[PDB]
Design an enzyme around this catalytic site. Structure first.
Site, short mmCIF file in Angstrom:
data_model
loop_
_atom_site.label_atom_id
_atom_site.label_comp_id
_atom_site.label_asym_id
_atom_site.label_seq_id
_atom_site.Cartn_x
_atom_site.Cartn_y
_atom_site.Cartn_z
N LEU C 42 0.83 -1.19 0.00
CA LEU C 42 0.00 0.00 0.00
C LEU C 42 0.87 1.25 0.00
O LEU C 42 2.09 1.19 0.20
CB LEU C 42 -0.93 0.00 1.21
N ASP C 43 0.24 2.39 -0.23
CA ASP C 43 0.91 3.68 -0.18
C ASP C 43 0.33 4.52 0.95
O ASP C 43 -0.48 4.04 1.75
CB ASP C 43 0.81 4.38 -1.54
N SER C 44 0.75 5.78 1.03
CA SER C 44 0.39 6.61 2.17
C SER C 44 -1.11 6.88 2.21
O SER C 44 -1.70 6.95 3.30
CB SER C 44 1.17 7.92 2.13
N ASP C 46 -3.60 4.93 1.13
CA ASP C 46 -4.23 3.74 1.70
C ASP C 46 -4.10 3.73 3.21
O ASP C 46 -5.05 3.41 3.93
CB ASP C 46 -3.60 2.49 1.10
#
Ligand SMILES: CCCCCCCCCCCCCCCCCC(=O)OC[C@H](COP(=O)([O-])OCC(O)COP(=O)([O-])OC[C@@H](COC(=O)CCCCCCCCCCCCCCCCC)OC(=O)CCCCCCCCCCCCCCCCC)OC(=O)CCCCCCCCCCCCCCCCC
Ligand SMILES: CCCCCCCCCCCCCCCCCC(=O)OC[C@H](COP(=O)([O-])OCC(O)COP(=O)([O-])OC[C@@H](COC(=O)CCCCCCCCCCCCCCCCC)OC(=O)CCCCCCCCCCCCCCCCC)OC(=O)CCCCCCCCCCCCCCCCC
Ligand SMILES: CCCCCCCCCCCCCCCCC[C@@H](O)O[C@H](CO[C@H](O)CCCCCCCCCCCCCCC)COP(=O)(O)OCC[N+](C)(C)C
Ligand SMILES: CCCCCCCCCCCCCCCCC[C@@H](O)O[C@H](CO[C@H](O)CCCCCCCCCCCCCCC)COP(=O)(O)OCC[N+](C)(C)C
Ligand SMILES: CCCCCCCC/C=C\CCCCCCCC(=O)O[C@H](COC(=O)CCCCCCC/C=C/CCCCCCCC)COP(=O)(O)OCCN
Ligand SMILES: CCCCCCCCCCCC(=O)SCCNC(=O)CCNC(=O)[C@H](O)C(C)(C)COP(=O)(O)O
Lengths: 175, 69, 88, 178, 56, 52, 459
Positions: C42-44, C46
């Protein structure tokens, strides 16, 4: 009751109607009144009976103090301190009695306004007029004296008023 | 589960209140009982005329027994 | 009376519940120790949606500075526990 | 609340905070769950549109005009969690929080009740008294000569050491103290 | 028994004694202002068959 | 507080009330005015004779 | 009056011959006994004052003031013995001696028959007060405060001395009874204008009048607790009592010589009340509140009506009790934390609940909640002022609001919120402090039941 004078504190003959029931339903107010009577007014009455039995055994009285009439401030010469003292004490006692007279009249006025219900504006006119007369007289005698009032200042106020009235009547006689 | 409740000390305020009530009552319960006993057994005087040639004492111009005394 | 005292075990069950209700996370391969960016990909953003879901879960808001670092479910459990004063 | 702040926020932190604020205010505007979910996905998309921008200047201007838009379109009455700094229960239980040092002023008759609690408290006090000097020395060891630079504190590193300056963090009253 | 407790609590008579002495001196001061006793136009009275003064 | 509560009526308010009661009874029993705007007798006053 | 006076004097050698550990006990017991005996001056004849002798007399104006003085002495002893514990036996006896001499001078001043004796005692009160402030004051600033308290007072009182001896040369007497019975109007001339000013300015500076009030924050803040108690409760009332006595020879000039003092007192009422809203020191706030209350008393005395004199008497008594209570309350916290700053200690209700109750009651009487006697006095003065001119209600109304504001501000700042984390030396309230607060408060509440006692001569 008879404790207070009914001429100074008068009240009308107290007409009350008779109950004229119109329904078969029981009136809960009268039943509540019987209950209140036989639970409250009888024990209280018995307690008062005992208290007054104990009071009657030891009966003693007190007497209202009566004060002579001494010379007023008009017949005191200018630097006589004893005549001035007695006149000033007499004037102060009279001032206190006049305050109480106005108090009695105001009590009458208030009692009338409460008693007459919705008809107070017509049925309390005599009480109102009586108060007006008393208030006017009391105002002339003591208003604007200020704190540090005295019989000499009351006399000076009366004399100023008498001079104004005399001069007004004199110039009315020239008319 | 039962936890401990952190409070400031209530001992000293409670002790002060008990002491104040105690002393006030210590002298004010006898006074209340005495005033009741006087009012019930002695009572106030009744207004009367000054009899012929008689001169009352200065305290005989008041009606309540405690005020008279 | 009101709600029973929270138990770390109920907390952690609840965080895992919300985490498997998230479409970007594999349920049969999510663990209490799974890193969000590193293991789950995931990224920030998410992770931000995840903290917001956690506040919606437990009914209390989490400050941005503190959240920046809740990068695994165990860290969220520890944060909620130390905030709401649960020891067991 | 628990973490030491840094000297400044990076562009990335500002962007994430604006994302969260925009989402919360949108939820305030979009009361229902489905409609909020729709517009929140539209928001995430509009947010992802500029995800991979390399020009820092244009990214900054995007952030700036986004903040202007948020300010013009914010909810005048956003939802606040009840115990949050604007909530209706924010500081409700602060009147029930009593510091622990008050327990030493208790009358001995008050401590007669609760003997076990107070024995265990004497143990805790012994622990703090015997850890203090090591804490001070460790903080003096691990700190640069020109004073500390951030509000960050080191953990314990030896066998029976405790993290320095722990007493008033460990002995907080409670958040529902009564 | 009472020797040394008298020697350490005798100071508790000073203020009550001063109170008594002050009442006495107030009475003596009253005794100097009798020029108008039973002589005021408001309270002048006939003495009772046995009383000597209207106030003391 | 008890001593102050039972202080005798040296301020003479009961006396004043009874005196006013006597006066009111006598004055409206005779049809006289309740109060007179003159506190002192005008026959005991000697104003300056001429006013102009 | 001798019966009250001799025992008070006796208190002097009783404390000088007492054992080192019994001075407080002895002084407190016999001070309370003296207060009880004094309580018997409240029986008043009605038409005139009680004249015990040629030298002394008691009034209905006077009786309330004397009872308050005698009652304040034991409270000052209770408040003092805590911070004076480290002191030597001789210096403790000297402090108690100062308090006793002050009580003796005060009792005599209120009951002196003539003005020269009143002046001498009214001025003699300066020496013990100055010694108390400058010798037992905690701060360095006390020396400056002492000078301000002395010089402001003497600059007003010396013209009064000249005026009094001149008046006795022209009239032949300064006896208050002769002064009253032989009163004659003051003509409108420059000589009479300056005689009026010389008769009024000493009492104006004692009140204090706004603009001549700068000595009071200094002196009341820098004094020890008992010094502050007696300065606020009783010593301010010397001005009011003296003005009420002296304004009998000043008519009819007062009708227009009062205008600037009325303007100063009303606007400065507003001013000092507003000042209380931005004050960082807690004693400073109570001092300015006293100023605001005494401005109301100055207005009441200047307009010269029976209702205004009644209100002034009631307000003087009520202020004396409330202000002393507030000073003692502030001193307890100062004793705890050794600083006067108001925001230093916060949320004290969490740590000291019964003291918070005392704080609430003192703050409620300060804002004149009905039916307390503070409101009785304030309402009577406001009505008299309304009769004087209907526009005074605007100023009076504004003052009522600002007073509520700063009273509740003080209460909220010191008692509510959360406690300062760092201060951990706030011990439980002592029985001595709680009893001191109760002995302030119970008498005030008791006074509501019998309002006429504190009403005065006009009643
Ligand atoms: C507290 C601890 C913590 C600290 C707190 C702070 C405390 C500080 C305190 C500081 C000290 C203060 C000291 C002050 C002392 C002052 C004393 C004083 O002034 O006395 C005055 C006064 C003295 O009376 P007086 O003027 O001398 O007497 C005149 C007459 O001659 C007398 O009339 P009489 O002789 O005909 O009457 C008979 C007699 C006795 O009467 C009777 O025996 C009979 C009564 C009637 C009974 C009828 C029913 C009973 C029997 C029925 C059942 C048995 C019979 C049937 C059985 C068979 C059934 C089949 O009457 C009495 O004696 C009354 C009792 C007097 C008690 C006074 C107590 C004062 C104490 C002073 C010290 C304070 C200490 C505080 C603690 C004390 C402990 C509490 O006493 C009272 O005022 C009593 C008040 C009564 C009030 C009645 C109710 C009125 C309520 C209306 C207003 C409220 C309306 C609603 C309001 C708004 C609500 C929303
Ligand atoms: C109106 C109600 C009538 C009730 C009848 C019985 C009243 C007997 C009370 C006697 C006087 C109270 C003494 C004051 C000092 C408090 C002592 C204390 O530390 O309490 C420890 C004690 C032990 O509690 P704790 O668990 O250990 O912890 C206590 C904590 O410190 C903290 O505990 P806390 O948070 O509960 O605080 C204690 C309490 C105590 O703090 C207070 O502030 C109480 C004093 C009230 C305000 C005082 C200044 C306001 C000016 C009014 C002056 C009226 C005086 C009249 C003559 C009274 C004679 C002493 O504070 C309050 O409850 C809030 C006060 C707000 C009252 C606002 C009412 C305005 C005027 C109401 C009517 C006044 C005229 C009556 C007739 C009107 C026409 C029919 O607590 C209590 O007992 C509570 C006190 C009861 C409340 C009384 C409030 C109304 C009474 C006013 C005077 C009574 C008039 C009687 C005539 C007949 C009517
Ligand atoms: C903490 C727990 C709280 C709960 C418990 C509460 C208990 C009840 C509390 C409430 C009691 C209400 C009592 C109401 C008063 C009833 C009695 C009252 O009427 O007495 C008044 C009188 O009160 C006294 O006058 C109070 C005098 C003031 C006391 C001073 C104390 C000593 C001085 C202390 C120093 C003062 C310094 C300041 C001096 C100026 C007025 O009496 P009066 O209607 O006429 O009586 C008619 C019949 N008489 C005249 C024959 C008696
Ligand atoms: C900061 C707080 C300080 C305390 C406040 C002290 C207040 C003192 C103020 C005194 C009040 C008024 C004083 C005298 C009343 C009237 C003054 C005068 O201006 O009125 C006119 C007087 O006319 C002229 O104004 C003459 C006076 C002008 C010279 C005085 C200088 C005023 C300048 C202000 C200086 C500030 C003084 C206070 C110093 C701090 C009235 O006309 P007139 O009917 O003919 O004179 C009446 C007197 N008669 C009957 C004998 C003839
Ligand atoms: C802490 C600050 C307080 C300051 C108070 C200062 C004001 C005090 C009031 C005035 C002081 C002097 C008044 C004099 C005392 C009264 C004596 C008197 O009445 O005699 C007058 C005399 O009146 C005077 O001589 C007074 C003149 C003023 C001389 C001194 C001037 C000092 C400053 C005056 C203005 C300040 C007063 C108000 C200031 C208030 C404080 C700010 C009339 O007598 P005769 O001479 O016989 O006249 C008729 C027969 N031909
Ligand atoms: C109703 C309430 C009002 C709502 C109005 C709000 C309006 C908002 C409109 C949209 C705002 C923008 O496009 S703002 C445009 C800003 N542009 C950029 O940031 C480009 C560079 N990207 C990065 O730096 C990172 O990839 C990052 C994106 C931070 C993610 O990082 P992680 O993946 O490592 O977490």
């Amino acid at each position: 009751p008879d404790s207070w004078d009914k001429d100074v504190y008068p009240e009308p003959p107290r007409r009350t109607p008779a109950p004229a029931p119109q329904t078969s339903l029981p009136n809960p107010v009268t039943y509540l009144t019987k209950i209140f009577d036989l639970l409250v007014d009888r024990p209280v009455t018995l307690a008062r009976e005992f208290i007054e039995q104990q009071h009657a055994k030891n009966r003693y009285y007190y007497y209202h103090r009566e004060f002579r009439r001494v010379p007023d401030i008009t017949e005191c010469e200018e630097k006589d301190i004893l005549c001035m003292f007695e006149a000033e004490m007499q004037w102060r006692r009279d001032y206190k009695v006049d305050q109480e007279i106005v108090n009695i009249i105001q009590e009458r006025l208030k009692a009338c306004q409460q008693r007459e219900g919705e008809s107070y504006r017509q049925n309390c006119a005599k009480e109102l007029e009586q108060f007006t007369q008393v208030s006017k007289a009391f105002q002339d005698r003591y208003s604007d004296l200020g704190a540090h009032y005295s019989a000499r200042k009351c006399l000076a106020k009366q004399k100023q008023r008498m001079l104004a009235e005399r001069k007004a009547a004199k110039e009315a006689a020239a008319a | 589960k039962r936890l401990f409740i952190i409070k400031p000390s209530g001992f000293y305020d409670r002790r002060f209140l008990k002491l104040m009530r105690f002393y006030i009552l210590l002298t004010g319960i006898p006074v209340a009982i005495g005033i009741t006993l006087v009012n019930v057994f002695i009572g106030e005087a009744e207004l009367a005329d000054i009899p012929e040639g008689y001169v009352p004492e200065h305290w005989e111009y008041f009606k309540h027994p405690i005020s008279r005394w | 009376s009101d709600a029973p005292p929270l138990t770390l075990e109920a907390i952690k069950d609840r965080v895992l519940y919300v985490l498997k209700l998230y479409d970007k996370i594999d349920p049969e391969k999510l663990s209490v120790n799974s890193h969000f960016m590193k293991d789950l990909g995931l990224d920030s953003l998410d992770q931000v949606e995840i903290i917001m879901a956690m506040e919606d879960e437990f009914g209390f808001e989490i400050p941005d500075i503190d959240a920046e670092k809740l990068m695994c479910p165990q860290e969220i459990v520890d944060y909620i526990a130390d905030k709401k004063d649960v020891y067991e | 609340a628990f973490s030491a702040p840094a000297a400044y926020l990076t562009h990335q932190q500002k962007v994430l905070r604006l994302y969260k604020r925009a989402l919360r205010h949108l939820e305030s505007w979009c009361v229902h769950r489905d409609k909020y979910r729709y517009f929140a996905c539209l928001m995430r998309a509009r947010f992802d549109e500029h995800k991979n921008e390399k020009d820092m200047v244009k990214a900054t201007q995007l952030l700036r005009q986004a903040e202007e838009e948020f300010w013009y379109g914010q909810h005048p009455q956003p939802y606040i969690f009840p115990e949050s700094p604007g909530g209706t229960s924010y500081e409700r239980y602060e009147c029930y929080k009593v510091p622990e040092w008050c327990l030493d002023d208790w009358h001995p008759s008050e401590k007669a009740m609760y003997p076990d609690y107070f024995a265990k408290r004497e143990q805790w006090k012994r622990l703090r008294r015997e850890s203090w000097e090591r804490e001070v020395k460790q903080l003096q060891e691990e700190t640069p000569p020109g004073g500390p630079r951030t509000e960050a504190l080191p953990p314990a590193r030896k066998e029976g050491d405790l993290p320095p300056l722990w007493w008033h963090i460990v002995t907080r009253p409670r958040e529902r103290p009564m | 028994n009472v020797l040394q407790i008298v020697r350490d609590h005798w100071v508790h008579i000073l203020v009550p004694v001063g109170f008594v002495f002050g009442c006495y001196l107030d009475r003596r001061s009253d005794e100097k202002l009798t020029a108008f006793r039973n002589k005021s136009l408001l309270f002048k009275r006939e003495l009772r068959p046995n009383e000597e003064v209207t106030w003391k | 507080s008890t001593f102050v509560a039972y202080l005798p009526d040296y301020r003479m308010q009961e006396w004043a009330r009874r005196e006013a009661e006597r006066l009111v009874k006598y004055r409206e029993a005779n049809g006289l005015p309740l109060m007179e705007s003159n506190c002192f007798d005008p026959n005991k006053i000697q104003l300056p004779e001429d006013e102009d | 009056m001798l019966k009250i006076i001799i025992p008070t004097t006796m208190l002097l050698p009783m404390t000088w011959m007492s054992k080192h550990n019994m001075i407080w006990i002895n002084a407190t017991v016999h001070s309370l006994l003296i207060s009880l005996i004094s309580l018997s001056l409240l029986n008043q004849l009605g038409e005139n004052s009680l004249n015990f002798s040629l030298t002394f007399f008691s009034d209905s104006l006077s009786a309330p003031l004397l009872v308050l003085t005698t009652w304040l002495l034991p409270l000052m002893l209770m408040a003092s013995q805590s911070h004076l514990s480290k002191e030597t036996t001789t210096r403790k006896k000297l402090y108690i001696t100062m308090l006793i001499l002050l009580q003796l001078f005060l009792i005599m001043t209120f009951t002196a028959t003539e003005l020269i004796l009143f002046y001498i005692l009214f001025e003699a009160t300066l020496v013990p007060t100055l010694i108390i402030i400058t010798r037992w004051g905690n701060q360095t600033e006390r020396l400056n405060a002492g000078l301000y308290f002395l010089f402001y007072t003497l600059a007003g009182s010396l013209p009064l001395l000249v005026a009094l001896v001149y008046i006795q040369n022209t009239t032949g007497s300064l006896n208050f009874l002769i002064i009253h019975y032989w009163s004659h109007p003051l003509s409108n001339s420059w000589s009479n204008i300056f005689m009026w000013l010389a008769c009024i300015m000493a009492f104006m500076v004692k009140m204090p009048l706004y603009g001549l009030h700068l000595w009071l924050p200094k002196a009341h803040v820098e004094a020890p607790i008992a010094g502050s108690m007696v300065l606020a409760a009783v010593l301010l009332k010397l001005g009011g009592y003296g003005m009420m006595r002296i304004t009998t020879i000043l008519n009819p000039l007062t009708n227009y010589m009062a205008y600037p003092f009325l303007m100063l007192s009303m606007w400065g009422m507003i001013m000092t009340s507003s000042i209380c809203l931005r004050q960082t020191d807690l004693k400073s706030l109570i001092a300015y509140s006293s100023v605001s209350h005494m401005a109301l008393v100055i207005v009441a005395i200047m307009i010269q009506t029976p209702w205004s004199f009644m209100g002034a008497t009631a307000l003087m008594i009520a202020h004396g009790l409330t202000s002393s209570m507030l000073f003692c309350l502030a001193n307890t916290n100062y004793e705890r934390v050794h600083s006067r700053t108001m925001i230093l200690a916060r949320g004290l209700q969490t740590l000291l609940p019964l003291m918070a109750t005392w704080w609430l009651v003192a703050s409620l009487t300060n804002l004149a909640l009905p039916p307390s006697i503070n409101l009785i006095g304030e309402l009577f003065i406001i009505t008299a002022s309304f009769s004087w001119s209907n526009i005074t209600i605007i100023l009076m109304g504004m003052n009522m609001m600002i007073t509520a504001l700063y009273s509740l501000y003080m209460l909220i700042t010191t008692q509510r919120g959360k406690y300062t984390h760092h201060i951990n030396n706030i011990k439980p309230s002592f029985t001595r402090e709680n009893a001191l607060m109760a002995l302030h408060i119970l008498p005030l509440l008791l006074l509501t039941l019998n309002p006429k006692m504190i009403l005065g001569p006009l009643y």
